[PDB]
Short mmCIF file of all heavy atoms in Angstrom, two decimals:
data_model
loop_
_atom_site.label_atom_id
_atom_site.label_comp_id
_atom_site.label_asym_id
_atom_site.label_seq_id
_atom_site.Cartn_x
_atom_site.Cartn_y
_atom_site.Cartn_z
N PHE F 705 24.08 5.51 -0.18
CA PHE F 705 23.39 6.61 -0.85
C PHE F 705 22.25 7.11 0.04
O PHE F 705 21.21 6.44 0.14
CB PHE F 705 22.85 6.17 -2.21
CG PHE F 705 23.91 5.65 -3.13
CD1 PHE F 705 24.10 4.29 -3.29
CD2 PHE F 705 24.73 6.53 -3.83
CE1 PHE F 705 25.08 3.81 -4.14
CE2 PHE F 705 25.71 6.05 -4.68
CZ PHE F 705 25.89 4.69 -4.83
N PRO F 706 22.40 8.25 0.70
CA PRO F 706 21.35 8.73 1.61
C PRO F 706 20.10 9.20 0.89
O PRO F 706 20.14 9.62 -0.27
CB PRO F 706 22.03 9.89 2.35
CG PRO F 706 23.04 10.39 1.38
CD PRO F 706 23.54 9.18 0.64
N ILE F 707 18.98 9.13 1.60
CA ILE F 707 17.69 9.56 1.07
C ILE F 707 17.59 11.07 1.27
O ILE F 707 17.43 11.55 2.39
CB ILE F 707 16.53 8.83 1.76
CG1 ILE F 707 16.81 7.34 1.88
CG2 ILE F 707 15.24 9.07 1.01
CD1 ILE F 707 16.94 6.62 0.58
N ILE F 708 17.69 11.82 0.17
CA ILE F 708 17.66 13.28 0.28
C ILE F 708 16.26 13.78 0.64
O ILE F 708 16.12 14.66 1.49
CB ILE F 708 18.21 13.93 -1.01
CG1 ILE F 708 18.13 15.45 -0.92
CG2 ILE F 708 17.53 13.38 -2.26
CD1 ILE F 708 18.78 16.16 -2.09
N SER F 709 15.22 13.24 0.02
CA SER F 709 13.86 13.67 0.29
C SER F 709 13.00 12.47 0.65
O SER F 709 13.08 11.42 0.00
CB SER F 709 13.24 14.41 -0.91
OG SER F 709 12.95 13.51 -1.96
N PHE F 710 12.17 12.64 1.67
CA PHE F 710 11.28 11.60 2.16
C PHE F 710 9.85 12.11 2.11
O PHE F 710 9.61 13.32 2.28
CB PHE F 710 11.66 11.21 3.59
CG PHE F 710 11.24 9.82 3.97
CD1 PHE F 710 12.00 8.72 3.60
CD2 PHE F 710 10.09 9.60 4.72
CE1 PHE F 710 11.63 7.44 3.94
CE2 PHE F 710 9.71 8.32 5.07
CZ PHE F 710 10.48 7.24 4.68
N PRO F 711 8.87 11.24 1.87
CA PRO F 711 7.47 11.68 1.83
C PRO F 711 7.00 12.18 3.18
O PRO F 711 7.61 11.96 4.22
CB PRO F 711 6.72 10.42 1.40
CG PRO F 711 7.72 9.64 0.64
CD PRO F 711 9.02 9.88 1.34
N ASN F 712 5.87 12.88 3.14
CA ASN F 712 5.33 13.51 4.34
C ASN F 712 4.43 12.59 5.15
O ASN F 712 4.50 12.61 6.39
CB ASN F 712 4.54 14.77 3.96
CG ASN F 712 4.70 15.88 4.98
OD1 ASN F 712 5.19 15.65 6.09
ND2 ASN F 712 4.29 17.08 4.61
N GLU F 713 3.59 11.78 4.51
CA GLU F 713 2.55 11.05 5.20
C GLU F 713 2.49 9.61 4.71
O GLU F 713 2.80 9.31 3.55
CB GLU F 713 1.18 11.72 4.98
CG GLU F 713 1.05 13.09 5.62
CD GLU F 713 -0.33 13.68 5.47
OE1 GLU F 713 -1.29 12.91 5.27
OE2 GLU F 713 -0.46 14.92 5.56
N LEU F 714 2.10 8.71 5.61
CA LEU F 714 1.79 7.33 5.26
C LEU F 714 0.34 7.23 4.82
O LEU F 714 -0.48 8.11 5.10
CB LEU F 714 2.05 6.39 6.43
CG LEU F 714 3.37 5.62 6.49
CD1 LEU F 714 3.51 4.70 5.29
CD2 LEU F 714 4.55 6.56 6.60
N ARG F 715 0.01 6.14 4.13
CA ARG F 715 -1.34 5.91 3.62
C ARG F 715 -1.79 4.51 4.03
O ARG F 715 -1.34 3.51 3.47
CB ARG F 715 -1.40 6.10 2.11
CG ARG F 715 -2.01 7.42 1.69
CD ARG F 715 -0.99 8.55 1.81
NE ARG F 715 0.00 8.53 0.74
CZ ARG F 715 1.08 9.28 0.71
NH1 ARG F 715 1.36 10.13 1.69
NH2 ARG F 715 1.92 9.19 -0.32
N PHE F 716 -2.68 4.46 5.02
CA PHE F 716 -3.26 3.21 5.49
C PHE F 716 -4.69 3.14 4.98
O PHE F 716 -5.48 4.06 5.22
CB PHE F 716 -3.26 3.17 7.02
CG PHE F 716 -2.01 2.61 7.63
CD1 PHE F 716 -0.79 2.68 6.98
CD2 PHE F 716 -2.03 2.12 8.93
CE1 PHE F 716 0.36 2.20 7.58
CE2 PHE F 716 -0.88 1.62 9.52
CZ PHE F 716 0.31 1.67 8.84
N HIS F 717 -5.04 2.05 4.29
CA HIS F 717 -6.34 1.95 3.64
C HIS F 717 -7.18 0.84 4.27
O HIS F 717 -6.77 -0.32 4.27
CB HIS F 717 -6.18 1.70 2.14
CG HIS F 717 -5.66 2.89 1.39
ND1 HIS F 717 -5.51 4.13 1.98
CD2 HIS F 717 -5.27 3.04 0.10
CE1 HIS F 717 -5.04 4.98 1.08
NE2 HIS F 717 -4.89 4.35 -0.06
N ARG F 718 -8.36 1.20 4.76
CA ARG F 718 -9.29 0.26 5.40
C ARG F 718 -10.33 -0.18 4.36
O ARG F 718 -11.34 0.49 4.14
CB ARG F 718 -9.98 0.90 6.60
CG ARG F 718 -10.91 -0.05 7.35
CD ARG F 718 -11.23 0.45 8.75
NE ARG F 718 -12.08 1.64 8.72
CZ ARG F 718 -11.74 2.81 9.22
NH1 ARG F 718 -10.57 3.01 9.80
NH2 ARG F 718 -12.60 3.83 9.14
N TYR F 719 -10.07 -1.32 3.72
CA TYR F 719 -11.00 -1.86 2.73
C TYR F 719 -11.93 -2.91 3.33
O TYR F 719 -13.16 -2.75 3.30
CB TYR F 719 -10.21 -2.42 1.55
CG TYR F 719 -9.55 -1.35 0.71
CD1 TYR F 719 -8.41 -1.63 -0.03
CD2 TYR F 719 -10.06 -0.06 0.67
CE1 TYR F 719 -7.80 -0.66 -0.80
CE2 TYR F 719 -9.45 0.92 -0.10
CZ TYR F 719 -8.33 0.61 -0.83
OH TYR F 719 -7.72 1.59 -1.59
N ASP F 720 -11.35 -4.01 3.82
CA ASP F 720 -11.97 -5.08 4.61
C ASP F 720 -12.92 -5.98 3.83
O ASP F 720 -13.29 -7.06 4.33
CB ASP F 720 -12.70 -4.50 5.82
CG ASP F 720 -11.76 -3.94 6.84
OD1 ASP F 720 -10.59 -4.37 6.83
OD2 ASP F 720 -12.18 -3.09 7.66
N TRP F 721 -13.34 -5.58 2.64
CA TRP F 721 -14.04 -6.50 1.75
C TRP F 721 -13.71 -6.28 0.29
O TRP F 721 -14.22 -7.02 -0.56
CB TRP F 721 -15.57 -6.42 1.97
CG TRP F 721 -16.21 -5.11 1.71
CD1 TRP F 721 -16.25 -4.03 2.56
CD2 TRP F 721 -16.96 -4.73 0.55
NE1 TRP F 721 -16.96 -3.01 1.99
CE2 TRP F 721 -17.41 -3.41 0.75
CE3 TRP F 721 -17.29 -5.38 -0.64
CZ2 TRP F 721 -18.16 -2.73 -0.20
CZ3 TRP F 721 -18.04 -4.70 -1.58
CH2 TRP F 721 -18.46 -3.38 -1.35
N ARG F 722 -12.87 -5.31 -0.04
CA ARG F 722 -12.47 -5.07 -1.42
C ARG F 722 -11.20 -5.83 -1.80
O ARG F 722 -10.73 -5.69 -2.93
CB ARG F 722 -12.28 -3.57 -1.68
CG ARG F 722 -13.51 -2.71 -1.38
CD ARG F 722 -13.44 -2.08 0.00
NE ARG F 722 -14.74 -1.67 0.50
CZ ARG F 722 -15.23 -0.43 0.41
NH1 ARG F 722 -14.53 0.54 -0.15
NH2 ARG F 722 -16.44 -0.17 0.90
N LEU F 723 -10.65 -6.63 -0.89
CA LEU F 723 -9.52 -7.50 -1.18
C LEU F 723 -9.90 -8.94 -0.90
O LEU F 723 -10.31 -9.26 0.23
CB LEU F 723 -8.30 -7.11 -0.34
CG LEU F 723 -8.12 -5.65 0.06
CD1 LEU F 723 -6.97 -5.51 1.01
CD2 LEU F 723 -7.84 -4.86 -1.20
N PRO F 724 -9.78 -9.83 -1.88
CA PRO F 724 -10.01 -11.25 -1.61
C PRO F 724 -8.93 -11.82 -0.70
O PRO F 724 -7.81 -11.31 -0.63
CB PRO F 724 -9.97 -11.90 -3.00
CG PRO F 724 -9.21 -10.94 -3.84
CD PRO F 724 -9.51 -9.58 -3.30
N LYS F 725 -9.29 -12.89 0.01
CA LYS F 725 -8.35 -13.52 0.94
C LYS F 725 -7.18 -14.16 0.21
O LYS F 725 -6.07 -14.23 0.76
CB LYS F 725 -9.10 -14.55 1.80
CG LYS F 725 -8.27 -15.20 2.89
CD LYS F 725 -7.95 -14.20 3.99
CE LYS F 725 -9.18 -13.91 4.84
NZ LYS F 725 -8.84 -13.11 6.05
N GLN F 726 -7.39 -14.61 -1.02
CA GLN F 726 -6.36 -15.27 -1.81
C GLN F 726 -5.50 -14.30 -2.59
O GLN F 726 -4.64 -14.73 -3.36
CB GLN F 726 -7.01 -16.27 -2.77
CG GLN F 726 -7.77 -15.62 -3.92
CD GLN F 726 -9.23 -15.38 -3.59
OE1 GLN F 726 -9.64 -15.46 -2.43
NE2 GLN F 726 -10.02 -15.09 -4.61
N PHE F 727 -5.71 -12.99 -2.42
CA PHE F 727 -4.99 -11.99 -3.19
C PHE F 727 -3.52 -11.94 -2.78
O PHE F 727 -3.19 -12.00 -1.59
CB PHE F 727 -5.63 -10.62 -3.00
CG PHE F 727 -5.01 -9.55 -3.86
CD1 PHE F 727 -5.31 -9.47 -5.20
CD2 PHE F 727 -4.14 -8.62 -3.31
CE1 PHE F 727 -4.75 -8.48 -5.99
CE2 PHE F 727 -3.58 -7.64 -4.09
CZ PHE F 727 -3.88 -7.57 -5.43
N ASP F 728 -2.64 -11.83 -3.77
CA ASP F 728 -1.22 -11.66 -3.54
C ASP F 728 -0.85 -10.21 -3.81
O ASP F 728 -1.13 -9.68 -4.89
CB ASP F 728 -0.41 -12.60 -4.43
CG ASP F 728 1.08 -12.52 -4.16
OD1 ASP F 728 1.51 -12.97 -3.09
OD2 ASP F 728 1.81 -12.00 -5.03
N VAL F 729 -0.24 -9.56 -2.82
CA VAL F 729 0.00 -8.13 -2.91
C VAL F 729 1.13 -7.78 -3.87
O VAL F 729 1.26 -6.61 -4.27
CB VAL F 729 0.25 -7.56 -1.50
CG1 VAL F 729 1.70 -7.75 -1.08
CG2 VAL F 729 -0.18 -6.10 -1.42
N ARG F 730 1.96 -8.75 -4.26
CA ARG F 730 3.02 -8.49 -5.22
C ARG F 730 2.50 -8.27 -6.63
O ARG F 730 3.23 -7.73 -7.47
CB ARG F 730 4.04 -9.63 -5.23
CG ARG F 730 4.89 -9.76 -3.97
CD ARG F 730 4.26 -10.68 -2.95
NE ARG F 730 5.26 -11.40 -2.17
CZ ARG F 730 5.02 -11.96 -0.99
NH1 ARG F 730 3.83 -11.89 -0.41
NH2 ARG F 730 6.01 -12.61 -0.37
N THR F 731 1.26 -8.67 -6.91
CA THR F 731 0.68 -8.48 -8.24
C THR F 731 0.34 -7.03 -8.54
O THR F 731 0.08 -6.70 -9.70
CB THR F 731 -0.58 -9.34 -8.38
OG1 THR F 731 -1.55 -8.94 -7.41
CG2 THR F 731 -0.24 -10.81 -8.17
N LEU F 732 0.31 -6.17 -7.53
CA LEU F 732 0.00 -4.76 -7.74
C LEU F 732 1.13 -4.07 -8.50
O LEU F 732 2.31 -4.41 -8.36
CB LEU F 732 -0.23 -4.06 -6.40
CG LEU F 732 -1.39 -4.55 -5.55
CD1 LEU F 732 -1.35 -3.90 -4.18
CD2 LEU F 732 -2.71 -4.26 -6.23
N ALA F 733 0.75 -3.08 -9.31
CA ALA F 733 1.75 -2.31 -10.06
C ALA F 733 2.53 -1.38 -9.15
O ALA F 733 3.62 -0.93 -9.52
CB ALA F 733 1.07 -1.53 -11.18
N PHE F 734 1.98 -1.06 -7.98
CA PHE F 734 2.62 -0.21 -7.00
C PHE F 734 2.67 -0.93 -5.65
O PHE F 734 1.74 -1.68 -5.33
CB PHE F 734 1.87 1.13 -6.87
CG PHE F 734 1.97 2.00 -8.09
CD1 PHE F 734 1.02 1.92 -9.09
CD2 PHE F 734 3.02 2.89 -8.24
CE1 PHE F 734 1.11 2.71 -10.22
CE2 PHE F 734 3.11 3.69 -9.36
CZ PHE F 734 2.16 3.60 -10.35
N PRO F 735 3.72 -0.73 -4.86
CA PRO F 735 3.90 -1.54 -3.65
C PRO F 735 2.86 -1.26 -2.57
O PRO F 735 2.35 -0.15 -2.43
CB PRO F 735 5.30 -1.13 -3.17
CG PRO F 735 5.49 0.24 -3.70
CD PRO F 735 4.81 0.24 -5.04
#
């Protein structure tokens, strides 16, 4: 099944202290 539409831009977020070291990224509601 081919991808008909793809997004335009990536989103890279520089937090560096708003994420704890023990945080698991699968717990987020969005990937």
Side-chain angles (χ1 to χ4, degrees):
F705 302 100
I707 315 297
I708 178 174
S709 72
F710 205 81
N712 216 347
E713 293 184 23
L714 262 299
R715 258 79 75 190
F716 271 27
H717 289 353
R718 183 163 69 241
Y719 290 154
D720 290 338
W721 61 279
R722 303 97 200 264
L723 330 173
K725 185 70 73 171
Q726 71 270 14
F727 185 77
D728 184 70
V729 82
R730 291 91 148 160
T731 61
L732 298 171
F734 292 91

